[model samples]
Target: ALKKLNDRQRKVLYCIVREYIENKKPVSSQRVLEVSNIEFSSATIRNDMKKLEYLGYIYQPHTSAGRIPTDKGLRFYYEEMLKISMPLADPEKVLFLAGNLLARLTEGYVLIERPNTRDLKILRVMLIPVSEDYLIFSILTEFGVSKVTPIKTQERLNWEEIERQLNFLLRGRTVGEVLMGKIESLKGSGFLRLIESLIGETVERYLDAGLENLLKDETLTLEDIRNLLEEVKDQKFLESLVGEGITVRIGREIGRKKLEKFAVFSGKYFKGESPIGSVYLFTSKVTKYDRNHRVFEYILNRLSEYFTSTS
Candidate 1:
């Protein structure tokens, strides 16, 4: 609809809409020029304003009076000018927040990216004893992310000595490197098993939750849930969900045919013009597509606002 107007008319339309929205009054060509800094002469603008009224975008409210926008005019203004910005610093909060909402709404699982993370290397390790038979092994990452795991001790060893040895061996090593072998070769100690348990956890790069609603969906079976458990652990599946604008995968459109009973929706969050990551939802066909799409738009704007304010 805006294509009906030339560039100068487009500028004039915005000026009238702005003055109308701001002052709640009819806009004369002089007023449009006053606010618009229009390089074109008032005579040329008055001509455009007359044409605008003829096009049903603007209408004269009284005899020989200033022009006001029609509903069509207001809509054109909105589409042209009222777009609602930026890069985000703390992406995890945005992801976790969106993930939680989409999961509940779709009665499906969601995945969101961890902020600025991949291949985490340990910065420190600590041991705090809970009781004679148990203790908490806490691992701290270079980025201040921490993981604490409770372990059952066969026999209470010297906690201080064990913590010292653990740091020297594990500190500064990537969880990926340690989990595969480095420490496994020198295994058989108590904290070694604890380290083995903590290895797979430390390197997690996404936040996923809201399975309570996912299980409540009758469309899913326990067998499908078992498959989904594996699917959630697969990083590539979540990566596949990141796409240009909003992405929708319906049943068979999902990569694996075995999981053809499912649907996926994904949309990217941004840091200014740059994309940060995606918020992905997995649901059954039983969910309403229309409502979910609307919900996606709502989350997108709110999340985008969340980024803009911080930027």
Candidate 2:
């Protein structure tokens, strides 16, 4: 499509589209002259805009009004304007870069969900005695010491015996799978029941903390925040977006009318050889494709590396 346009026409179209994105209004010929370095007369720019409209790249929203980029036009820019692909930064440095990168962008909002501890395989479990009546049960995982839950028992706990039992039962299981299994029923001892309850509580708390962190941003509207929290609460939407690579859903592409006003850019990160989690950015139309795509890809790749390396 870019090949079909003359140099001057492309210049006029780019300026008009950029102006509309910045101001959220139609771009008149005079406005294009003022905002862009196109160096064309109003009449010439108007003629070029007409050609662009004829090509289905832009549209006039009102009579005698300016032109705005249509989905076709935005798609063209995404394909043609964004060309740079730099290697992602190191894993430890990536999040800091991503944080600063997202902060500098002018867009709607961003949401990130980390790989849950339940997603990883349990390496082992240990019972560390903290006090006479209280002890800490630590669950080691591929993603580091994934959980540490405290246990309080009225009776004495045989640390070595319980640790051996727990390690045997949970060694190769994912936390999520173990939660559904009959770990409590397999062990009839009263002490094992208390340990089971502590494990359940710890896993619940960890999952809740992940949700809370995703909704921690305070800059969104009440309605927007509510919609975002609800969207992620069930994990269905997040699950749908997770895959091998980047997913771009624009405007009506999101398939929810209420969400038609926004565009979603999402991608999944890996743990070893498995896909574990995803990160998402919810922004309005007309976000700079170059910056948004570059930042999203870089951070997601780095995150995948971080998990794989740490695991």
Candidate 3:
């Protein structure tokens, strides 16, 4: 059976998660009331906050002014309270966060240099009918704009007829309009067809994106790699390093660990289909007191070596 929280406790927790994610600040009773819709007096909220703190769901930083949820608190709220009811608007920045990385790569600057990127431009856009039941769209983005052809999936059309349908969509617009978001209105009826034409075309066609150049320009010696591996030797620490997802922290948010002393920037890269291959990025302790680039590649490569051999 599950333990239940009182209404005041739930409201306090909602305030904690909201405040932490927003201002990244500690939650005080006054601040909680200012931001939450709890309909209670500050004194009432403070007493509930004290009780919740005693129950191990919240912790106060020694140097901070008030309290924040412990990891246990975060997990419980994520699994139970937060997911159960209708969520408030996902903060305004969510639309940009909707798709997987591969989907974003097609449009964002980060993937512009990726080896698997297509320098596709919209050469032509058109709309045409397919068997009086559906529509077809053809776009030309590959090789200075390829022609678009929408053929009915169930109704067969010959090649020349398909080419004509494509020509109808390409109605004399440059390929770049789609890239610049000007012709997004063209995506309506034949949207699914658009994905088929553009998906993974960069990687498959070998577009020669320069991100791999990032690997070669980053310099590290066998000694540098060996020293870093020796510095981070505990398996438990490295296991956290290898865990999935990305994490970021401001100063004092990430406390010093016994194994290493610096800010860590870590994330994963997929290998074709496997979800488990990831790497670590930690700031270097030498050559500069606070620079991160020196060890980013070095830490990742060392961990790669560890994972390849361990399991």
Candidate 4:
């Protein structure tokens, strides 16, 4: 805790994390002083540094090199930073724009799960031709096109006719009811099951952007990024990850060996009092500990406001 350190040491810890965040290197007491505008004559700062290290808040990685925040130190710095404060349209278009805002600010990839589809009625459905034997099934909702998938049919029937029929049969129905097979009998029965399957897929699939940003961290190997991509596919792990609150995970605390080099900040978005989904930013390395969290909280609030005021 910052409480254990004298106020000066607390400020020292802050500068260490901040300097490492910007410089990506071990910090020297001199460098710490340079970053600190508060005048600390060399000797007092040096001795305080010794006690900070002895207390396990910082460590010297090499015999003659400067200090680095150990995990304990990082936790202290991050926990202290946390003691602060703290969308629309295609509505899917809005979510991704929200993702872009966070991605640019954090320099990290953003993942947003769509709110649950239970109360959302289907805005429209379109079946576009892929080939004579295959057709693309598309569903549109307030969140724009919800899902698009290909289906096969040996019948070379009237394609345009079926498109209109499907829309007439299912338009304006709640997605949950359709998934539960509550539809009255209709000519599109052949496509009903197929339609169900398409909506069932991707209801909460993450919409991603700034994925290329993950490559910015030269610290990661191809296999590291590769395996991290693999874990992102695990629904149970990702969906249950930040369901109803805010979370900050650093290093291996991120829950995958391959992900140990990264940090993640996840915040749940809501429809006012009720949660709709989550948005999270992935850091190549932990930086801006408190700023990131504060920004995440703000993103969630804006999204909650957007939904509450929209139809």
Candidate 5:
């Protein structure tokens, strides 16, 4: 019931939560007064704190100490108190942004993944003769160029015939279409076997360059590092998290009990309305705090320009 809180209570609560986030400690009524110029008596501030606690916005960890915000309070503050916007940028900004972010958020790591190329259609296919037994297979897709070389097979390959047949079967088709082109049974034939193998490699090689653990915190336990390594390597899991706008998942809200103690902030990059990639930040703290959210906003805002400029 956000409607139930008065402006004074909201302002006081905001100050207490901000202090808690920064210091990682409970905040006392006296502490709030020192940080905020609410022009209210200590007794009045205490009364407001009690009301906010009753409303489920904050809680007292110990009777003698002050209050710390509950998850409900953090969510409320993020939704109401934050002023967020994307910053202006240049191309290839990811390199610069990741480097700078790594320096600042040293307690955690950074992960970026390129978008799926399934939707991009093939423009050309070529099979160049490398030797009698092997060839260099190449594909030109709307996204970029990819090639496979020294393709070894027991059967002899007719480079010219394979090139012409592949161009007819693959050009103008999406990678996904070629992959699922019901050619599995066609592998019984020599030429189709070559096509199947080439297509399989193309799909397998379409991997995003994943995590860069820039944080060098000695306090991170072995288990912590191990879990992070596993999570970052789970490319499909990361891909499912990409969204049209910014997303914040805190602690248990992250859904995996293994990851329940962490917070993830992510935003997908787009070319026009089509999403092309994503940027993510992982931290042990509730980075949903206003300041950290702004960091993500800046990174995500610049991503489109970076890739667009390269194109």
Candidate 6:
């Protein structure tokens, strides 16, 4: 596929994806000329651009003369052209920090804090049923707390039994909202006090709150929640994709519309029984901040603790 392109054309395509990703704008020949390693003139770069456009690799926005890559162009670059010569070597100690935080908090998953039995295992999950037919399920992964605030269909169940079971599991320790990685106090004046208002409030203490109350639950819309479940459901595909050691650059996703503007870097995390877990970082084009390997490295360092691989 690359046989058709001479060196200049290849460089041109690379330059365009890079520029567009960084500036969020079309790339002009002038910009490419500056980065061209082959010392091509602006005119030659412009001609290459036209050829690339004809090849259906790049497009020009109406408001700007500079060229931007279409989905095809980005796919080509990501799959066939771009070489990840350098991955971020060192990441900030995010995992270590997160592990310490989770260890300190002792409990978090549901809006309520259960008893802290210590040596907590199984990464407790909480499902809070909202009005109508939607339920919000939150996961307190051993690594840290992550809540998926998407809505979805609910299986019929006894509310009283579910509540009792959850209370029994959480009889001793205190739990708080899944704050992703944010460290907020869950004491009486902190996250716990706030969530208590949802249950044990001074006013009408109803479990179901309006939109404002919805915020207390994570934003689990129907579709969003489905995506998370799908990720979990397709364990084999997820395992291979991460295990195969492939990094998906911008525009080179599995053809999902939602993934177009984001770059995903993934690697497999292993436990003693088998390598099952995966760590991935998603970066938005608009932010233009290359997370590099910070997120992944964080996962790798502390993952062994919860993993059976560790003693």
For each candidate, what is the lDDT?
0.70, 0.65, 0.44, 0.74, 0.65, 0.48
Best by TM-score: 4
The lDDT, on a scale of 0 to 1, for candidate 6 is: 0.48
Give per-residue CA lDDT, model 6, range 53-168, as digits (tens): 99888988896879988767766655543355312111113333443333223211101111121332424545678865876654343434433343554567765475455445
Better of 1 and 2 by TM-score: 2
Q: What's each prediction's TM-score? A: 0.47, 0.72, 0.34, 0.74, 0.62, 0.47
Compared with the true structure, what per-residue lDDT tens digits does model 1 show for residues 1-311? 54778989988988887777566678999989899878988889999998999898889878856897775665565455425303433345456667788777766777666544336577778898989888887766633434556777787778999888888887887766765665664377754775766754454566787777668777678887777778867778777766778867765557776666666778876647766567777776445555566777688777766655544
Best first by TM-score, ranked: 4, 2, 5, 6, 1, 3
Best by lDDT: 4
Q: What tens digits encode model 2's per-residue C-alpha lDDT throughout 30-138?
A: 9988987877689988888888999988998778578888777776666666653334323323444554455345343555554464565777888888888877777
Q: Which pairs of residues clash in candidate 1, taking residues 3 or more apart in a chain or in different chains?
A: 86-271, 86-272, 87-271, 87-272
**Residue ranges of candidate 6 with Cα displaced over 4 Å:** 75-243, 249-252, 285-309
Clashes of 6: 18
List candidate 4 segments past 4 Å from native.
62-64, 82-88, 117-120, 123-168, 171-204
The Cα error of candidate 5 at residue 261, in Å, is 3.1
lDDT of 4 by residue, 1-311 (tens): 53678788888887888788788788888888888885878677778889989998788877855787776777777777767531224466678677888887777888888766677788788888888888887777764565666778787888889778778877888777766667754324656666666665435468787777778766567887787788888887776557447887777567677787777888777665777787878876547777777777887787777776654
lDDT for position 263 in model 6: 45
Name the better of 4 and 6 by TM-score: 4
